[PDB]
Amino acid sequence: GQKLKDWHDKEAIRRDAQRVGNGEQGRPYPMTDAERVDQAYRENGFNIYVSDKISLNRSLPDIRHPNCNSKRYLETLPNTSIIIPFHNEGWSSLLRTVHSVLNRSPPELVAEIVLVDDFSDREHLKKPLEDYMALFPSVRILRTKKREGLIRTRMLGASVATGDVITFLDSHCEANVNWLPPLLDRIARNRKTIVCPMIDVIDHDDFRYETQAGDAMRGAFDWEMYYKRIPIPPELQKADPSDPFESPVMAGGLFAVDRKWFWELGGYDPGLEIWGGEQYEISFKVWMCGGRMEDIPCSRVGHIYRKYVPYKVPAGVSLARNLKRVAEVWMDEYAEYIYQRRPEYRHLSAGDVAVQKKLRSSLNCKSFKWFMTKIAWDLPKFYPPVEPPAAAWGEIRNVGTGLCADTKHGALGSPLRLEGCVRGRGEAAWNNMQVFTFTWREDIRPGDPQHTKKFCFDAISHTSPVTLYDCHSMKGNQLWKYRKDKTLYHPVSGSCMDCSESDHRIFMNTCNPSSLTQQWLFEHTNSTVLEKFNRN
């Protein structure tokens, strides 16, 4: 008995496609001064004024892969308990999340929808929410007795679920067309596989719906434990780009997992606080202890990434203590790589992690070395546990004008001006930043090679100036080369770096070896590194 089935509710797709109105089809909302106010963000970190003006049943673009519409899945699948943790979430944003589930999910595959109130103090989340959800049979509200935080809140929900697999979602998401079956099917085939849908963006301003940059990518992180996304290496890339693909680390709130398998792993470290950490612990657990983690390209859910965090966090809580707890129990020797960047994580009491450590042994999991080597082998490529030395660092002095490269500390995107060399002898009042580093990544960022900033030398046109745009280990507009001719050749622009003898900014122009306004000289260097990525 393994009969397939097409779960595409076509009629729906049609009626949703013929829907009209603001925000419809995922388009940006017609902003007006009335919605641009600073008070429209104060409660959620995202524009609640706009959300209120958008339909709780709005329609979304089907930005799936062309193949996804043609897939079919097991006629019979295990039911799921969709669990949603919330804390002072906005009325319209939360309602929309649920509607999207009640309308885009096959009722039969939905055992129950449990909203879990994490001690919210907002009035609309009390009686009104109750009366509103009462009209919806499958929906159920379960509150906590005190502020637990997202981890414990998700645990409470998971401890009451009755469905075959547990699905977690944030309280400000919008599931797209036919998302649930592809997550359930995959688990029906492999009970120990955790599945994560493609997480799309919902603009915290105009609410347009759209895929994140680079779309389908692999999860990972830097050594300060900030979640990161990196390209799927070619050797791992699947034949059919719409098929499930392994991922090292999950994003965090959007994922499904078999209920038994979940608890078999011990769920989350109850010691984790309000936010952050549970995504790494759960991620290392599935892998190191026999399971697997996969992204289902055919399954997409929108999520509103906050502009800032509104809720308050209890005193005596630190993201650090969480990470440290995870670092001790699963990362082994690699934890030391976290401390080298953040020393305070050494003499920082990570509470009692004895119980968890005991869970790790009772599971017979592999070492963290195994994880990094077989599952996350590409992460060290962009985030090496130890970074290669730099090529050149210090002050960039232009031979032509004799002046030094400077920056009025305009990290938002200010041009790369040119001022008189300070050398650290100048008055620290003229906001002078004449220190730079040609990092191993082949990019140029401000600051000492030990304390660089996440801003790189970004240059578009082979004539445009040079700005400081957010970096990214993707040799493009931030790819530079320092040649024997003392120039900063920009291959992606075919031009070189040139300044103005009329005391202005710096701009791109035709390369000219025998010149001066394009000849620069760093203070310190390591030819051994320069001699590297200089050849084709």
Ligand X SMILES: O=c1ccn([C@@H]2O[C@H](COP(=O)(O)OP(=O)(O)O)[C@@H](O)[C@H]2O)c(=O)[nH]1
Ligand Y SMILES: *[C@@H]1O[C@H](CO)[C@@H](O[C@@H]2O[C@H](CO)[C@@H](O)[C@H](O)[C@H]2NC(C)=O)[C@H](O)[C@H]1NC(C)=O
Question: Buried (b) or exposed (e) across 75-91, using 16+ Cβ within 10 A?
Answer: eebbebbbbbbbbbbbb
Interaction of residue 278 with ligand NGA, rule CB under 6 A: yes
Distances (CA, A) of 442 to 80, 221, 222: 48, 20, 18
Residue 488 gets which letter from DSSP? E
Q: Name the maximum alpha-carbon separation found in the chain.
A: 80
The residues pairing with 139 across neighbouring beta strands, listed in sequence order, are 113
Which is nearer to ligand NAG, 5 or 306 (by Cβ)?
Answer: 5
Q: Are 318 and 217 in contact (CB under 8 A)?
A: no
Nearest Cα neighbor of 93 from 303, 343, 399 is 303
Nearest one of 456, 518, 455, 448 to 483, comparing CA atoms: 518
Which does residue 102 touch among ligand Y, ligand NAG, ligand X, none (CB within 5 to 8 A, set by kind)?
A: ligand Y
Closer of 201 and 516 to Mn ion (Cβ): 201
d(CA 222, CA 244): 24
Which range binds ligand Y by CB under 6 A, 65-73, 96-104, 423-431, 437-445?
A: 96-104
Which of positions 134-173 make contact with Mn ion (CB under 5 A)? 170
Chosen from ligand NGA, ligand X, ligand NAG, none, partner binding at 389 (C-beta under 5 to 8 Å by type): ligand NAG
- CA atoms of 500 and 493, how far apart (whole Å): 19
Q: Which does 162 bind (CB under 5 to 8 A by kind): Mn ion, ligand NGA, ligand NAG, none?
A: ligand NAG
Q: 501: closest CA among 488, 478, 519, 480?
A: 519
Amino acid letter, residue 221: F
The one segment of 19-27, 91-99, 271-279, 291-299 that binds ligand NGA by CB under 6 A: 271-279
Q: Which residue has the tokens 């009686």?
A: 127
Task: Choose which of 89, 164, 273, 395 interacts with ligand NAG (CB under 6 A).
Answer: 164
CB neighbour class for 154 (10 Å; exposed up to 12, middle 13-18, buried from 19):
buried
Q: Which of residues 40-69 bind ligand Y (CB under 6 A)?
A: 57
- Residue 170 binds which one of ligand Y, ligand NAG, Mn ion, none, with CB within 5 to 8 A depending on kind? Mn ion
Q: Which range, of 143-151, 473-481, 508-516, 524-532, touches ligand NAG by CB under 6 A?
A: 524-532
Which residues from 184-203 bind ligand NGA, rule CB under 6 A?
Answer: 199
Q: Which does 149 bind (CB under 5 to 8 A by kind): ligand X, ligand NGA, ligand Y, none?
A: ligand X
Q: Using CB under 6 A, which of 102, 526, 530, 533 touches ligand NAG?
A: 526
Task: Tell whether residue 197 is a contact of ligand X (CB under 6 A).
Answer: no
3-state helix, strand and coil shares in percent for the chain, rounded to the nearest 5: 25, 20, 55
Residues forming contacts to ligand NAG in the complex (CB under 6 A) are 79, 111-112, 162-164, 389, 526, 528-529
Residues forming contacts to ligand NGA in the complex (CB under 6 A) are 150, 170, 199, 227, 251-254, 275-276, 278-279, 303
Residues forming contacts to ligand Y in the complex (CB under 6 A) are 57, 99, 102-103, 135-136
